[PDB]
């Protein structure tokens, strides 16, 4: 095809994205925002309507004043390695905060791309009003919820199954074909949300 949808979507992301104060990888930051521009303008416009910002980081999480209490708190599975939220690869909630180079697979998380996955935790719980609670989805989540692995993440919150399957549905065609083959009803659910 062409780049027209991506050019509009990267310009819509400009309106809600926040970069570091200096000393960061500008090609990988802009490539993260391009990988998120490749998703859908309807959800990008809806997060812009909801003023939900994209915080790109290259430093301590505790250097943002909204995470100043988040120094010694220990997240699930990091007690055994002695680690805290201050060094997290990225997170989501009232805002999504994302660490350049650490949102890559295998940097202290098992997700295939944590950028798109934490962004999808925002699309789900802002734009779709947490559709992951809904019993029609839940029948499929109980059927197919772990056929793409990552089971000590996809077994903790329902946004994890949605966002990992959504990342397999957006990131690359080998992951499209793997999700279609492993979670077939889930691809038929996701196409009906996406259309
Ligand atoms: Zn997650």
Swiss-Prot record:
Zn(2+) binds at residues 117, 121, 153, 160. It comes from the Bacteria. The keyword Zinc-finger does not apply. Residues 10-195 form the ATLF-like domain. The record marks 110, 117 as: Interacts with substrate peptide. Its EC number is 3.4.24.89. It is an enzyme of class 3 (hydrolase). GO terms for molecular function: metal ion binding; metallopeptidase activity. Is inhibited by the chelating agent o-phenanthroline in vitro. Disruption phenotype: Cells lacking this gene retain CD630_28310 on the cell surface, show higher affinity for collagen type I with attenuated virulence in a hamster model of infection. The active site is at residue 118. One of its GO terms (biological process) is proteolysis. The keyword Metal-binding applies. InterPro entries: Anthrax_toxin_lethal/edema_N/C, ATLF-like_dom, MetalloPept_cat_dom_sf. The structure of Zmp1 is similar to anthrax lethal factor (LF) metalloprotease domain IV. The S-loop of Zmp1 undergoes large motions upon substrate binding and seems to exhibit a function analogous to that of LF domain III, thus contributing to sequence specificity and substrate binding. An aliphatic-aromatic network and the diverting loop contribute to Pro-Pro specificity. Belongs to the peptidase M34 family. Pro-Pro endopeptidase subfamily. This is Pro-Pro endopeptidase. It comes from Clostridioides difficile (strain 630). The gene is zmp1.
